[PDB]
Design a protein around this ligand. Structure first.
Ligand SMILES: C[C@H](N)c1ncnn1C
Ligand SMILES: C[C@H](N)c1ncnn1C
Ligand SMILES: C[C@H](N)c1ncnn1C
Ligand SMILES: C[C@H](N)c1ncnn1C
Ligand SMILES: C[C@H](N)c1ncnn1C
Ligand SMILES: C[C@H](N)c1ncnn1C
Ligand SMILES: [Cl-]
Ligand SMILES: [Cl-]
Ligand SMILES: [Cl-]
Ligand SMILES: [Cl-]
Ligand SMILES: [Cl-]
Ligand SMILES: [Cl-]
Ligand SMILES: [Cl-]
Ligand SMILES: [Cl-]
Ligand SMILES: [Mn+2]
Ligand SMILES: [Mn+2]
Ligand SMILES: [Mn+2]
Ligand SMILES: [Mn+2]
Ligand SMILES: [Mn+2]
Ligand SMILES: [Mn+2]
Ligand SMILES: [Mn+2]
Ligand SMILES: [Mn+2]
Ligand SMILES: [Mn+2]
Ligand SMILES: [Mn+2]
Ligand SMILES: [Mn+2]
Ligand SMILES: [Mn+2]
Lengths: 190, 190, 190, 190, 190, 190
């Protein structure tokens, strides 16, 4: 019913997305960027989407191209799956506490792309989350939210009220976006 | 069930309101102040009210008297239609993104009039929204929210978190008030 | 189903709590600290808990030991009654207007104790609410929210956006916590 | 070759656009908003487009809905007329002196919507340009540039380096956008 | 006609450059520093050079020696390929929007080395762009522009007007330099 | 075709100008003010004018009268040679790096005299460039640009973005004006 498959092939990367808005959190994400996989898994899961993301790209340069192409493809999938948007809540918002961090997201499935990203501490503009694989530059958080909003053609407002840990700050925002979208896409009984 | 017809006849104006709290967004508004009509249409629609507003007044002076008398009559209608307020959520709140603008409203159907209006940029105290008819002075936004709260006998908190466009800022607040009221008036299953 | 009886006996006090998460606001609170009774009655009632609190302690010293032991016991009861937390909303938040005051609470039933308490005016750190019985030092507000979060093993974020009256400020926060918990404990239909 | 006809019919307005990128400045604009007509005539003319804009809307509210719908439709027309964007300069920029005013615009026909609007004096956020017809609120300048960029799917950077007259400031920006687009859409001989 | 092959062999690295000023963007770059490869590919491509860069060096230390030796060799190639500079535009400049970033470069093929690098945010002095290979320290951006200007014996002015993403900021500057050089090297018909 | 001879005889000086807009940089300048000769030679040359300037005046007082009368006569020559301005680019701009200095000029051949001169360091208001002949007070730079714009009846915006050497700062501005005029006077193929 509210399903979309998107294939996005650029010079930099290859994305396949399958998205059901009316899922149960059946999520599988593989981008070659394990922190990004974790954020997109949290997003699909907390939005009660069924979501599959398979992506490969030029991670020898860094994660940016793959992260962005994935967020563009995912936005386009959200846009297509929503269709005409008849009968939905349209507006959604969620607070996510994560230990010391409090994040908020608010959505209007308006059909007009807009993203306002505020309150993220300045040190996230040069912070790296790094393990044994491809690292994740938190400066990309904004870019992901912008790409998503631009291609789904929605208003997306993401706020960090406060926080310290860059992992708590980043995950709280992805989870906020996710639960905001969940409320906004659900059928409006009136 | 939760219906009220209010007639308000002053030296300055004539107001008829018909309000059903349990509507489907069947809204008709005619005040001679077309921007106000647009805001009150957004309010009735986003609150899932059935609402009829017919108003005439001294618009040769300006919109103020008609705007205020209408907001007083509309408040009184909300107050009467709520009745004893048995079994309702009582508390409601909503975030409204509108492009660059984010507004919020929170309500307590307490039976104690109170309005706190914060965060609206200072230039809305001398901004005019003007077309081919009677103009709308955004300084009146507060007055409308105050009049509504005073006569419905509710606590109404309206916040502009941020914004630039006076039309986005004003409409976002009316829509926030509307969805806050919608959540607050709905039956509480517990 | 989601019931817990907690008995807590310290050198300073004796607490019995009985808590049903799936109640109708059947609340009885007796701590010897009548303002605290009023706050805990508001909390149980606004959370739609069935709640019984019987506490006696060393109020000849002041309310602190009894308030804290009660909040610890109540937290432990919330923790036990939630059990494995299968199938619940998990996240909850609420705005509470109270005349001039606006408070907010957000919860994550994470299993990781955390409390962030912000925005409370500085004069509540030496304010007393006093009647004909044992008085209530508002400096204890934070301590109560911290104790509750620590022993229920949840993330609890409590914000005063603004306010003036210490009674409005305190009650608004307890009511916010209550409605945040109510949303968070309810079954998630998905 | 690089032609597009767009029809956009909303609740608020009716837009017809016909756009040839490879024109000689054959421009006809009728929106019911004569200052807007003047700005869009300057844009089509200074971009050497052939452009026809016919729009009607709810100007009894004010110009906003009609201005925005027109800018959305015009953006969509630019997007469609560019097609695959094979063989073009892609990047374009122009300085426009206008008496005391200096404006600049830079474009990347990237396929990624983005608009950065800077340097416009603060008083243009509540300035009105008013004649004998529907007035023009200069706060809308940004909104127009944003709408255009979002729907043409280009990067558009518009700068006021300095200026005083709101008419000089506004027209200089529209002319800058126009000549930036003209350079960017032209065939790249290499 | 305007071709140069440069071989540069230091203790730290081995560089081979082949450069045609009058190319079609036939570019192949391999330095062992994949982000640098991406920047130098963008530069050759956006300048419509035919360009081959093969470099190996002491990347076990970090990218610096290889980046610098490559920029020195590339500058020397630009210098030799320009020859006597008879009949060329000499002056060139370009604006590059890249999402939120706006960069500018201006060139004078003067025969006097000079580089002015301004406006780059302070956090790019300790930012790393890191993937699965050798990372790129953005502090090197200036060094690259300086090395290039010193060895091509040109005036090179590179400006970041504004920006946030270090990848957008860096790539925008390389693209600006590239299009500035493209305009400056082209035959002057007068 | 686009030629003008101007003779200007005041109490203070005697000017003969011959100007072809469609020249090859055939320039001869003799004012008795050798630094001025150098600046006007750079201007005619970098604008691809054919230009002859012969001037004599009261240099025993200082260069001012001769500089100004020459700039007035030269402006009048530009005005007359442009004629009706049918079919020209009209708008032109150029960046000129000169070692540490970056200057910019933008022109609108509008038929409305206007000059905005900004960014020149304050010490150029009392700097002298002095050799073995009549010296040049850099405070006159503005006066020259103003005189030129007033009598050619064009908008001329001249910016020093930054610089240190008064000779680099002055020459960069004359060269910027020159290349801005060159782009603006050239035939517009559309
Ligand atoms: C496991 C969860 N994703 C988490 N990330 C950082 N902190 N926590 C609790
Ligand atoms: C049409 C809607 N009422 C609106 N007003 C201002 N902007 N937008 C989108
Ligand atoms: C009765 C209620 N608990 C209250 N306390 C302070 N103000 N109000 C209304
Ligand atoms: C006529 C032109 N559109 C203009 N508008 C304001 N000033 N000027 C010269
Ligand atoms: C693909 C392109 N090189 C790019 N890098 C960062 N952002 N974008 C669009
Ligand atoms: C020779 C040229 N006119 C010049 N003047 C000052 N510096 N330079 C290079
Ligand atoms: Cl989780
Ligand atoms: Cl709407
Ligand atoms: Cl109550
Ligand atoms: Cl908030
Ligand atoms: Cl014009
Ligand atoms: Cl600039
Ligand atoms: Cl590119
Ligand atoms: Cl020279
Ligand atoms: Mn990007
Ligand atoms: Mn995690
Ligand atoms: Mn009044
Ligand atoms: Mn509207
Ligand atoms: Mn204690
Ligand atoms: Mn009370
Ligand atoms: Mn709008
Ligand atoms: Mn005009
Ligand atoms: Mn070095
Ligand atoms: Mn890139
Ligand atoms: Mn003078
Ligand atoms: Mn010189």
């Amino acid at each position: 019913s509210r399903r979309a498959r998107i294939e996005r092939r650029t010079r930099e990367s290859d994305i396949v997305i399958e998205l059901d808005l009316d899922g149960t959190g059946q999520v599988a994400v593989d981008t070659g960027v394990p922190f990004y996989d974790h954020m997109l898994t949290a997003l699909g899961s907390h939005a009660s989407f069924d979501l599959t993301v398979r992506a490969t790209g030029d991670v020898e340069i860094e994660a940016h191209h793959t992260i962005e192409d994935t967020a563009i493809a995912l936005g386009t999938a959200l846009g297509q799956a929503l269709g005409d948007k008849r009968g939905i809540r349209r507006f959604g918002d969620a607070f996510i506490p994560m230990d010391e961090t409090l994040a908020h997201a608010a959505v209007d499935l308006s059909g007009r792309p807009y993203c306002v990203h505020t309150g993220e501490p300045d040190h996230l503009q040069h912070t790296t989350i790094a393990g044994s694989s491809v690292p994740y530059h938190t400066v990309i958080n904004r870019h992901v939210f912008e790409s998503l909003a631009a291609n789904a053609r929605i208003a997306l407002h993401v706020r960090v009220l406060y926080g310290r840990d860059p992992h708590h700050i980043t995950e709280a925002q992805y989870k906020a976006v996710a639960r905001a979208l969940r409320q906004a896409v659900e059928p409006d009984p009136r």
